[PDB]
Amino acid sequence: ATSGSCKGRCFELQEVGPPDCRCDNLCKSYSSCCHDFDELCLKTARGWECTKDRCGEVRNEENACHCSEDCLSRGDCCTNYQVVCKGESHWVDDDCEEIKVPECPAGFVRPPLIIFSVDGFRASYMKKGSKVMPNIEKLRSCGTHAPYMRPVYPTKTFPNLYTLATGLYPESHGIVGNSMYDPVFDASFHLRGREKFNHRWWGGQPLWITATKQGVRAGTFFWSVSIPHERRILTILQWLSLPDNERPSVYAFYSEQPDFSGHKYGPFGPEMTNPLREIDKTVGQLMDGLKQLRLHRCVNVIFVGDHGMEDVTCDRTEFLSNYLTNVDDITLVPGTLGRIRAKSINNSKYDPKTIIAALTCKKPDQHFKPYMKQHLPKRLHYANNRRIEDIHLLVDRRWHVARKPLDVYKKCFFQGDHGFDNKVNSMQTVFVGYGPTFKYRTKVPPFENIELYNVMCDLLGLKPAPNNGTHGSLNHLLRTNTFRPTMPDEVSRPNYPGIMYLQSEFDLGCTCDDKVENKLEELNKRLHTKGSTKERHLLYGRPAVLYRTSYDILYHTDFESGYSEIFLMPLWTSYTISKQAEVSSIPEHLTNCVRPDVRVSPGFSQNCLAYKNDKQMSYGFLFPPYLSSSPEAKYDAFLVTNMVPMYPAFKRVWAYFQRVLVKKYASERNGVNVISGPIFDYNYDGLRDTEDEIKQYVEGSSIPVPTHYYSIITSCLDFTQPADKCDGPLSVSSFILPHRPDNDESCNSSEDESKWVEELMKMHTARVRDIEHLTGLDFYRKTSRSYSEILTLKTYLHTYESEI
Ligand SMILES: *[C@@H]1O[C@H](CO)[C@@H](O[C@@H]2O[C@H](CO)[C@@H](O[C@@H]3O[C@H](CO[C@H]4O[C@H](CO)[C@@H](O)[C@H](O[C@H]5O[C@H](CO)[C@@H](O)[C@H](O)[C@@H]5O[C@H]5O[C@H](CO)[C@@H](O)[C@H](O)[C@@H]5O)[C@@H]4O)[C@@H](O)[C@H](O[C@H]4O[C@H](CO)[C@@H](O)[C@H](O)[C@@H]4O[C@H]4O[C@H](CO)[C@@H](O)[C@H](O)[C@@H]4O)[C@@H]3O)[C@H](O)[C@H]2NC(C)=O)[C@H](O)[C@H]1NC(C)=O
Ligand SMILES: Cc1cc(OCc2n[nH]c3ccccc23)c(C(C)C)cc1Cl
Ligand SMILES: [Ca+2]
Ligand SMILES: [Cl-]
Ligand SMILES: [K+]
Ligand code: NA
Ligand SMILES: [Zn+2]
Numbered sequence: 140a141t142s143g144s145c146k147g148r149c150f151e152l153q154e155v156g157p158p159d160c161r162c163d164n165l166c167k168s169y170s171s172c173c174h175d176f177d178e179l180c181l182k183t184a185r186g187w188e189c190t191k192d193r194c195g196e197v198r199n200e201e202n203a204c205h206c207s208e209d210c211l212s213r214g215d216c217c218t219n220y221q222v223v224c225k226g227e228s229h230w231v232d233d234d235c236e237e238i239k240v241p242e243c244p245a246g247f248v249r250p251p252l253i254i255f256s257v258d259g260f261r262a263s264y265m266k267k268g269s270k271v272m273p274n275i276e277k278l279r280s281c282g283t284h285a286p287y288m289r290p291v292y293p294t295k296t297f298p299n300l301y302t303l304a305t306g307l308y309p310e311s312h313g314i315v316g317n318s319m320y321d322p323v324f325d326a327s328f329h330l331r332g333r334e335k336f337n338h339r340w341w342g343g344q345p346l347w348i349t350a351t352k353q354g355v356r357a358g359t360f361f362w363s364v365s366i367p368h369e370r371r372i373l374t375i376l377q378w379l380s381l382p383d384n385e386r387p388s389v390y391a392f393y394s395e396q397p398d399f400s401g402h403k404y405g406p407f408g409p410e411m412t413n414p415l416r417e418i419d420k421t422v423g424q425l426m427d428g429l430k431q432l433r434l435h436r437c438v439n440v441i442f443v444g445d446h447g448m449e450d451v452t453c454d455r456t457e458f459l460s461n462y463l464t465n466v467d468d469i470t471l472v473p474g475t476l477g478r479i480r481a482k483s484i485n486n487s488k489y490d491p492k493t494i495i496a497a498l499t500c501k502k503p504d505q506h507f508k509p510y511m512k513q514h515l516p517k518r519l520h521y522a523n524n525r526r527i528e529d530i531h532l533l534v535d536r537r538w539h540v541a542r543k544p545l546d547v548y549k550k551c552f553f554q555g556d557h558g559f560d561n562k563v564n565s566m567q568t569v570f571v572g573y574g575p576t577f578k579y580r581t582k583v584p585p586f587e588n589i590e591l592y593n594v595m596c597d598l599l600g601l602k603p604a605p606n607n608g609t610h611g612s613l614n615h616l617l618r619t620n621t622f623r624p625t626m627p628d629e630v631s632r633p634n635y636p637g638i639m640y641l642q643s644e645f646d647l648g649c650t651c652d653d654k655v656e657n658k659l660e661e662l663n664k665r666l667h668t669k670g671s672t673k674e675r676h677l678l679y680g681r682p683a684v685l686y687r688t689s690y691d692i693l694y695h696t697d698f699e700s701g702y703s704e705i706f707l708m709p710l711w712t713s714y715t716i717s718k719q720a721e722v723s724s725i726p727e728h729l730t731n732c733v734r735p736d737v738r739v740s741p742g743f744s745q746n747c748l749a750y751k752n753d754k755q756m757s758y759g760f761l762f763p764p765y766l767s768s769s770p771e772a773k774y775d776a777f778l779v780t781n782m783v784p785m786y787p788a789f790k791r792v793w794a795y796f797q798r799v800l801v802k803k804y805a806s807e808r809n810g811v812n813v814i815s816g817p818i819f820d821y822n823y824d825g826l827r828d829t830e831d832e833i834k835q836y837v838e839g840s841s842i843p844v845p846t847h848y849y850s851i852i853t854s855c856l857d858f859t860q861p862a863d864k865c866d867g868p869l870s871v872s873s874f875i876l877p878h879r880p881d882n883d884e885s886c887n888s889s890e891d892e893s894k895w896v897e898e899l900m901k902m903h904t905a906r907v908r909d910i911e912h913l914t915g916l917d918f919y920r921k922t923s924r925s926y927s928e929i930l931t932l933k934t935y936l937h938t939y940e941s942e943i
Contacts, residue, residue, distance in 0.1 A: 145173045149180035150374045152356070152387065164374075167363035168336065187369040187424075189217045194224035204373055211431065214380025218372065218424040221431050230426035230435060231274045235281035241575040243437035246383040249355075250575055251434070252598050253375065254391040254441045255425065256303070257418060258296055259398025259557065261406055261447030262287030262567035263943055264415065271412055272419040274426060275571070278442055281580060282573030283616050287943055289587045289936070290446045292519045293317075293476050293558045294566040296398070297335075299445035299588065304360065305343035306592025306606025308520040308825075310527065313342040317558075318472055319526045320480070344604035346595055350389050353601050358390040368394060368421050376428040389599060392425070394418055398557075401448040405554035406565065439574030439598055443591070446557045449536055449565040451475065453551035457506050457534075460543040463497050469542070475558030477507060477532025477540040491529055498532070500886040506538040508884070513823040516903050517847065517875040517913070518936065519561065520607075522823040536563050562904075562938040576620050583616055587934065597622055609908055612930040624926055627917055629683035633692045633701065636738040645741045648748030651732035653774055660771075667696040667772075675863055676714045678812045679853070680921025684710070686827065693738060693780055696772040698762035700780070704743040705830055707842050708783050711816045711916060712761035715863050716805040722798065725764050729777065733758075736780040744779050745842050753838035755880060759785040761815050763797035783817055784837050784844050786880040792899065793848070793876075795892035800900075801852075808854035808870070810862030817845035818875060818913045827915040849875045849910045851918065868924065872937035875905040875913065907933040 145162035155161050160173035162180060184201045185193075193206035203217075206224060210216035221227035241250045265284075269276055291302045291309055295317040298309040309315045319328040321340075328335050347357035358378055362371050375390045396414040404410040422442070429435040459479075460466045468489065472478040481489040491511070498509040510531045512522040521527060534540050536559050541547055559566055567585070576598055593610045596603040597620045603610065611624030677699050684690065684701070690710065691702045698714040733747050750758050760781050767773035775781070785793060804811045819828040821835075835844040851873045855865030876899070882888035887895040907918055911933070919929045 141171065141173050143173050145176050145179045164359040164363060164366070165361065167365055181366070181370065187217055189220045189223040191223060214377050216431060218428040218431070222427065229423065230430045231277055231423055235277060237579045238436050238575045241437050244433055247437060249388060249600060251379065251438045252389050252441070252595060253438055254443065255422065256300065256391060256393045257397070257442070257444045258393070258395050259401045259446065259448045260444030260569050261565060262569055265569060267407070268415045271416050274419050274422040275442065278422070278440065278573045279571045282571055283577040283581045283583060284571045285583050285585050287567035287585045288443070288570040289585060290561050290566060290568055291588060292521055292561040294446040294561050295558050296445055301341065303443065303588055303591055304345035306589055306603060306608045307343045308589065308607050310520055310522060310524045311343060311607065313340055313524060313526065315524050315526045316472060321526050323525060346389065346592065349596060349601055349604055350599060355389065355599055355601060356387040358387045360391040362393050369424065372421060372424045372428065375425070376432065379432060379434060394421065398448065401555040402553050405450050406448040408554065436575065439572065439576050442569065442571040444568030447566045447568050448555045448557050449559065450554065451537055451539060451556035452554055453547055455537055456539045456541050456547055458541055458544055462501055463494065466543060469494070471542040472528070473541045473546065474539055475534050475556050477534060478528040479530040479532070480528040494530060499883055506535040507532045507540050514877055514879070517825065517909055518905050520825055523825065533560060536565060562940060564940045564943055567943065572616055576617055578616065578618050586613060590934065593622070609930050609934050611927050612934045614927040615931065624930060626920060626926065627683070627685055630686055631684040631688050631690060633690055636691050638737045640737045640740060642735060642737070645735040645744070647735060647741065647744060647746040647779060648751065649733035649735065649746070649779060651734045651777060652728040653732065653734060668694055670694045672696055673699055678715060678863060679919045682711050682916040682918050683920055684915065685917055686915040691739065695775040697766070697768050697775060700761070702739065702780050707743065707745050709761055709780070709816060710914060711814050712781065713812070713814045714762055715810065715812045716766055716801055717810040717861060717863065718805055720766065720802065720805060722765050722802050723767065732777040733779055733782060734774065734777050736778045739780055745782055746840065749837045749840035749842060755786065756784050756837050756844065757787050757790060758782050759790055759793050763801070765798050766801060784842060786878065788881050789878055791882065791892060792896055795896040796900065800897065804852055808862065809858045809860065810854060812853045812862050814851045814918065816849055816914065818847035818849055819843060820846050820913055825912050827913055845878050847875050847877055847913070849873065849905065851907055851910060868928065869932055871907060871932055871935055873905045873907055873910060874900050874903045875909060876900065876903050901939045904937050904939065906936050
């Protein structure tokens with residue numbers, strides 16, 4: 140029962156043992172507050188602002204906040220008190236002055252952190268709404284800011300806030316949507332309802348728990364809906380005046396705006412100016428309140444959004460009923476994404492394959508694309524959770540998907556929505572960091588919100604729980620408190636084999652027209668096989684292998700590789716193509732040439748016979764024959780140790796990349812270095828498969844079939860310098876292409892490769908870091924750049940969007 144009292148307990152920080160009634164922030168959410176909660180803890184009398192007449196008033200405990208002489212000591216002045224009653228200036232009116240050191244009251248052990256979060260705050264509001272947000276604009280221009288921050292997918296509220304709290308992808312923390320079904324719980328999670336409150340949904344370790352476990356106290360992060368914003372601000376300010384042994388060090392504020400209005404009015408509806416005004420005034424209240432408590436040059440403030448907002452209306456809805464016949468046999472999680480599962484598990488007459496086929500390229504202008512979850516772009520990291528349905532629909536920006544038209548009129552309401560692919564410009568959101576530990580007047584490049592958890596932990600002197608950020612990749616945001624990152628140690632050292640086998644030892648079923656045999660160039664041919672050109676084709680040192688395996692370094696005139704004796708193919712193949720380089724064809728007589736490698740045993744080689752016998756699987760080459768430096772060097776490209784298994788449908792993509800695109804990138808970027816290789820992720824967890832996890836081999840062999848192929852393409856950021864002679868910062872783009880036996884993903888694939896290939900590759904853009912997880916390799920080990928800068932480079936994603 141709720142029979143006790145909140146007198147002296149308002150917004151208490153510890154949760155009281157039930158059923159003793161509660162006075163903490165969550166009580167309202169559980170219907171468990173004491174009977175006098177509203178009266179005592181949610182006072183509203185006289186508003187939130189001191190006025191001239193209230194100054195020096197006789198304290199009255201009924202007031203929402205206070206203008207009496209004792210209010211600073213009691214910690215409960217209205218935020219504008221010192222301005223009205225003491226002739227002080229608003230914080231926004233003060234010039235900004237660099238904060239070189241924390242300027243905190245006696246008893247403060249560390250600068251507090253306040254996370255000020257705003258729902259639906261699209262990145263471009265910073266520029267487009269600048270005239271109406273003077274407090275936010277001062278934070279932004281005086282502190283450290285990014286032009287935008289990339290959310291996680293789906294670009295919904297709980298998945299993104301819980302990613303901020305934990306540093307984890309939604310697939311790992313478990314909050315994979317604003318709505319979800321868990322098939323093991325046989326339970327559904329919604330925005331409505333009490334289900335979302337069960338701790339069984341929320342995995343990982345959020346910042347507040349990380350803090351508590353290491354002796355740093357945390358304010359509440361979840362604010363009950365009914366508590367107004369002025370009262371949240373005042374609660375944080377009151378907690379900040381607690382005695383040293385009770386005062387938290389980490390605080391959060393949350394606003395439902397501008398998202399709430401953005402849904403109704405669209406992202407730039409005229410109605411949107413006022414919510415931006417109101418958020419700014421709330422920021423003003425906090426800064427004035429901090430400055431009153433002499434904390435405005437002590438506290439680190441993060442102003443951060445969860446996602447942006449796109450124009451979306453009822454009439455831009457695709458209906459599954461217009462594609463399927465058995466539309467009543469499915470359940471759809473609708474909207475700016477789609478997730479489909481059977482309406483009943485006691486129905487084995489349910490075929491995902493027929494459903495996908497019925498949804499693929501059916502209408503010329505189709506505004507979604509179906510995927511099995513394991514085939515989604517690896518950059519989304521959206522598969523490894525039982526709450527993610529096998530069938531996913533990626534919806535075009537500005538559109539919705541729904542099951543049947545009745546779901547739209549029997550559920551126009553709205554003009555804005557969010558949830559799309561996280562590379563979409565309209566879904567980008569904001570980051571500003573302001574305070575003694577952040578830099579002064581500094582712009583940093585856009586980065587992903589998965590990285591912030593490590594930085595908040597550094598800000599608080601905490602050791603972060605295991606997470607998906609790359610610790611040190613955001614060191615450049617901070618004045619001090621930088622983590623000191625170090626390269627992981629190489630686990631496996633390579634072998635450097637010489638010529639050990641005679642041709643006749645091999646029985647691989649391979650042939651080649653190669654017997655058309657001079658000490659000027661015979662000394663040189665041995666030179667190249669020993670590593671003379673290795674400084675040209677391996678520019679950043681050899682990748683380190685971070686797991687236990689057996690592998691060989693193989694040198695060639697045009698390329699170097701790391702050849703795995705366990706997977707029977709290279710883990711990486713590295714080569715440099717200069718701006719000047721020539722493309723040539725595979726000579727007629729060498730169309731089907733494959734040559735045994737005299738450095739590598741028959742027993743650790745692939746064989747041509749398995750490919751002949753496997754009617755589905757063909758093969759390609761990692762270093763492409765088309766880019767050989769001479770007719771003589773081209774023979775190296777046909778070594779058995781350069782070959783990888785490729786479906787004919789995939790060879791269309793691969794050959795166009797190698798024959799056309801590598802050269803175009805070299806021309807555009809003043810040379811490129813390329814590192815290519817296979818990826819095996821049969822259990823779709825984003826991590827390198829062990830040999831015993833492989834589910835497909837080339838028929839009747841031990842040759843494993845990659846699920847994906849990658850390339851990392853590096854050049855000089857200053858493109859006046861050639862890739863191979865670059866003195867400064869690097870520039871990288873990468874991809875992870877799915878290795879698929881059809882091109883059903885590309886609706887225009889029946890046309891020439893020049894109309895569809897590059898579009899596919901763009902969709903499958905990747906971070907170097909994503910490739911490192913998938914390979915157990917560590918790249919860029921020998922450069923002249925600092926390790927923190929290299930970590931930033933490894934987290935870079937080339938998105939192919941236009942400028943914000
Ligand atoms: C992003 O960062 C995160 C965090 O670093 C990375 O995720 C980690 O990956 C690790 C390797 O996969 C994984 O390690 C495993 O942990 C098992 C213990 O699991 C529990 O305890 C931990 C620690 O407290 C906890 O965090 C886990 O939380 C998960 O599960 C709960 C529900 O139970 C959820 O609330 C929560 O959201 C989270 O779910 C996510 O992860 C699980 C997998 O753990 C997925 O299934 C979910 O879908 C979801 O994504 C757990 O509460 C431990 O038992 C494992 O050890 C077995 O396997 C290893 C290696 O394969 C082997 O060496 C061991 O000997 C052992 O094998 C034996 O057990 C097998 C399984 O029962 C059995 O089949 C064998 O026969 C053997 O007998 C393993 O070490 C770690 O838990 C997660 N952590 C998180 C939070 O996700 C993530 O990889 C990064 N992503 C990228 C792309 O880099
Ligand atoms: C800064 C932050 C705020 C936050 O929640 C804010 C919140 N309060 N009330 C809400 C109602 C709907 C939606 C969100 C909220 C969370 C949750 C995951 C706990 C995490 C983080 Cl990092
Ligand atoms: Ca894997
Ligand atoms: Cl959702
Ligand atoms: K074949
Ligand atoms: Na196609
Ligand atoms: Zn919303």
